[PDB]
Design an enzyme around this catalytic site. Structure first.
Site, PDB file in Angstrom:
ATOM      1  N   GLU A   1       8.776   9.517 -11.622  1.00  0.00           N
ATOM      2  CA  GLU A   1       9.159   8.431 -12.583  1.00  0.00           C
ATOM      3  C   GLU A   1       9.627   7.397 -11.781  1.00  0.00           C
ATOM      4  OE1 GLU A   1       8.656   7.283 -15.698  1.00  0.00           O
ATOM      5  OE2 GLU A   1       9.957   8.467 -16.834  1.00  0.00           O
TER       6      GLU A   1
ATOM      7  N   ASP B   1       0.676  -1.233   0.012  1.00  0.00           N
ATOM      8  CA  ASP B   1      -0.005  -0.122   0.093  1.00  0.00           C
ATOM      9  C   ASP B   1       0.736   1.379  -0.040  1.00  0.00           C
ATOM     10  OD1 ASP B   1      -3.258   0.101   0.363  1.00  0.00           O
ATOM     11  OD2 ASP B   1      -2.346   1.790   1.080  1.00  0.00           O
TER      12      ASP B   1
ATOM     13  N   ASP C   1      -4.812  -3.070  -2.314  1.00  0.00           N
ATOM     14  CA  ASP C   1      -5.944  -2.293  -2.110  1.00  0.00           C
ATOM     15  C   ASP C   1      -6.293  -1.258  -3.239  1.00  0.00           C
ATOM     16  OD1 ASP C   1      -8.302  -0.993  -1.039  1.00  0.00           O
ATOM     17  OD2 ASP C   1      -7.763  -0.736   0.892  1.00  0.00           O
TER      18      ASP C   1
ATOM     19  N   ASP D   1      -4.583   0.997   3.873  1.00  0.00           N
ATOM     20  CA  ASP D   1      -4.763   2.274   3.290  1.00  0.00           C
ATOM     21  C   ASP D   1      -4.953   3.393   4.338  1.00  0.00           C
ATOM     22  OD1 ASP D   1      -7.727   3.869   2.128  1.00  0.00           O
ATOM     23  OD2 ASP D   1      -5.672   4.826   1.435  1.00  0.00           O
TER      24      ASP D   1
END
Length: 704
Positions: A539, A500, A569, A681
């Site tokens: 990036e 996550d 998630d 999360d």
RNA sequence: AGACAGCAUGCAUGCAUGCUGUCUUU
RNA sequence: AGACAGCAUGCAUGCAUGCUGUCU
């Protein structure tokens, strides 16, 4: 065992199949792609879908060229390629796109809402200690693609909760600081958190002109119109910056409220209309879908009046055994298992800090009794609880509680677990949103301290033993002494890894970010976790972050050629996927990689109480999956699971998911997410808010 | 000639009614 | 159902003007 979903097969086969195709004069910036498509459909007046870099209008145009203006003032020019004929949609996106536009042109959705009002207007507005509250029906449509390849209309119903109160009103009536409110603009199908508020006295004239000139809706047009003419309004009126980069005047912005952040009394009236049971819901869905058929069939749209069906039930390994080998299969709890259960005692002195919040001084007896019986139970299990400190906090509102919890929680250091008794706190300021239980949970999660927050409402309502166990089972897990293990899981998996990642933004550039990773062995016990903040990479972030997860698995001696499942998630984007293969090779692992999309999936409507394990199979290896049984009142929303890649069937990946469900160690509450990514999360967003670089790890479910 | 009333047309205020549109609920 | 705008009306009081009748 029939279970139906609100999905309905859909196809488009008109008599006139003649569209006019338009092409950009130069490649369009990708997130500008939808704004342009929308714009084509306004000018044209003709439904439009996007076909790679080209635009398809369902009618006859003449206009050689066609100029569209974005909010920037930026102008994209489309050239007419010429008429092309239509045979099929390439994907659901096209289909959705065009479908909604038809809904718009025909005005069915608008009619239904009106109609719905003529008839329930009165039952839909309710009264409260101080406020009035509207519950507004939201009809919503997505197009999905099933396993056999049929397209499917995903149709749903909800009641957006709103006040009768402009945002401006609340900012003069108060002088308030609410950069934490969600909002909808009248006549705009958008909902999103208030980003930045300034006043209108700071912007010229040509400004509100352009602002008007570019408004893509009637009400925003008419809004800026006002500020463009009436200068009396200007100095007074406020201007609000929105989530995904919009600005609107404050008079067209009304708050959007959540059930939770309703003051108690209100919650109660609301509850029946907002939480409506499957049958009714399904009947309205059915009812709308009819209007839709009736109103769209004449333009060539073919919609089954019949709900797709659950393809079946997956069995998954739900067998569980304690440190003696006593075992029983998990359906609901086995309150019985937990009584006679005998946990894997790893740490047998535990030091608790106790906190209690409460109105008055001498009414601790329920709490004291409850605590007494926990300590006891836990002792009869090889664990002695030892109390380092108690704090009785007296307080009279949530705020007073809050202000006072802050230093108390602050001093807390070196402890296995904190137990917190929270008194009932009745209402608040309705803008001053705040759940007190959460706050505590939040403050303690920030400290990596495993905590148990017991609502004093719970002890007044539920039975001491019932409660005793629910707590006893979490606390045991929380603090490292796992109460039972899974016998096994389908497949020959070596580790299940939950990733996550949250990222703070600034000018579309990713600045802070926090990764939470959790690794579990084959039988599904946590091995270590990893809480890592990252500074700015751009990036390169995505690569580093995964890279770490691999260099990590190896330091845990996952012998190369081992098999690694990766639940997530979020919603994995292209660069991650490739990023994963890269490291899959370099480290020499066979990887299954999944995407779990938890929010807003189609619903099962079924007679069976025990829908855990049900499913419906969508195109491209993704599945709608029930992970928990319908406990009534609150919504059962299934998870959508999706094999991005891997050698294993998705059905096999799904059962693992169902197995891991049980490792959240919450037999009683119905945890929707599997133990690899559950609350992941929450933690990730939570540490983000944080204010200094983080790099911690450990081997204990401190977050449960 | 003044002072008062019935009616008509045109206008002033007040209150009330029928239909249609908008938005509330693109 | 409410808020506002379009239109069509009704009752009431007075003024304007006009013929009407009473009046000291």
């Amino acid at each position: 065992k029939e279970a139906l979903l609100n999905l309905y097969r859909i196809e488009y086969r008109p008599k006139d199949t003649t569209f006019t195709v338009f092409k950009p004069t130069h490649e369009i910036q990708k997130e500008k792609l939808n704004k342009v498509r929308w714009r084509v459909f306004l000018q044209t007046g003709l439904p439009t879908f996007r076909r790679e870099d080209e635009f398809w209008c369902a009618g006859k145009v003449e206009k050689d060229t066609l100029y569209l203006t974005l909010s920037n003032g930026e102008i994209v020019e489309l050239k007419r390629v010429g008429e092309e004929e239509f045979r099929g949609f390439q994907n659901e996106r096209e289909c959705q796109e065009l479908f909604r536009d038809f809904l718009t042109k025909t005005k069915v959705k608008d009619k239904f809402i009106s109609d719905f009002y003529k008839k329930f207007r009165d039952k839909i507005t309710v009264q409260g200690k101080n406020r009035k509250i509207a519950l507004i029906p939201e009809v919503n449509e997505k197009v999905l693609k099933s396993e056999e390849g049929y397209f499917l209309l995903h149709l749903d119903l909800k009641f957006r909760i709103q006040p009768f109160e402009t945002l401006q009103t609340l900012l003069e009536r108060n002088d308030f600081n609410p950069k934490r409110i969600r909002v909808k603009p009248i006549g705009i199908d958008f909902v999103g958190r208030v980003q930045d508020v300034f006043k209108a006295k700071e912007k010229g004239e040509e400004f509100f002109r352009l602002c008007m000139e570019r408004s893509t809706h009637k009400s925003s047009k008419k809004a800026w119109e006002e500020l463009l003419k009436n200068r009396e309004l200007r100095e007074k009126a406020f201007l609000v910056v929105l989530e995904k980069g919009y600005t609107y005047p404050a008079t067209i912005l009304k708050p959007v409220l959540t059930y939770e952040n309703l003051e108690d009394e209100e919650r109660n009236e609301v509850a029946d209309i907002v939480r409506m049971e499957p049958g009714k819901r399904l009947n309205l869905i059915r009812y709308i879908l009819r209007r839709y058929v009736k109103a769209l069939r004449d333009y060539g749209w073919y919609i089954s009046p019949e709900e797709e069906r659950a393809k079946g039930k997956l069995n998954f390994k739900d067998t569980v055994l304690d440190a003696k080998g006593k075992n029983t299969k998990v359906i609901t709890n086995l309150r019985k298992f937990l009584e006679l259960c005998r946990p894997f005692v790893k740490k047998d002195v535990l030091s608790v800090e106790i906190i209690s919040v409460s109105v008055y001084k001498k009414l601790e007896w329920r709490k004291e009794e409850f605590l007494k019986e926990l300590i006891n139970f836990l002792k009869n299990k090889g664990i002695k609880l030892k109390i380092k400190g108690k704090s009785l906090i007296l307080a009279q509102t949530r705020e007073e509680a809050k202000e006072k919890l802050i230093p108390v929680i602050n001093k807390i250091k070196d402890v296995d677990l904190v137990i917190v008794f929270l008194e009932e706190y009745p209402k608040v300021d309705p803008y001053k949103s705040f759940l007190l239980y959460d706050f505590v949970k939040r403050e303690l999660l920030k400290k990596m301290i495993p905590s148990q927050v017991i609502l004093n409402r719970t002890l007044k309502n539920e039975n001491l033993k019932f409660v005793l166990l629910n707590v006893a089972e979490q606390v045991l897990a929380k603090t490292g002494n796992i109460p039972y293990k899974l016998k096994e899981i389908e497949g020959k998996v070596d580790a299940f890894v939950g990733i996550d990642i949250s990222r703070i933004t600034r000018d579309g550039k990713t600045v802070n970010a926090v990764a939470f990773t959790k690794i579990f062995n084959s039988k599904g016990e946590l091995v270590r976790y990893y809480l890592t903040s990252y500074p700015a990479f751009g990036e390169k972030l995505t690569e580093k972050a995964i890279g770490d997860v691999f260099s990590l698995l190896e330091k845990l001696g996952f012998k190369k050629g081992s098999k690694i499942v990766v639940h997530r998630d979020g919603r994995l984007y292209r660069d991650e996927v490739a990023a994963f293969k890269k490291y899959g090779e370099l480290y020499g692992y066979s990887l299954e990689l999944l995407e779990i999309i938890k929010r807003n999936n189609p619903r099962f409507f079924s007679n069976e109480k025990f829908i855990k394990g049900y499913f419906y199979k969508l195109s491209e290896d993704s599945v709608i999956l029930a992970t928990y049984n319908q406990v009534y009142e609150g919504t059962h929303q299934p998870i959508k699971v999706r094999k991005v890649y891997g050698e294993l069937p998705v059905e096999v990946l799904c059962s693992q998911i169902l197995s891991l469900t049980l490792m959240n160690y919450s037999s009683f509450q119905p945890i929707k997410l599997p133990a690899t990514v559950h609350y992941s999360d929450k933690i990730t967003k939570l540490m983000l808010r944080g204010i200094e670089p983080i790099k911690k790890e450990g081997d204990i479910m401190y977050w449960l």
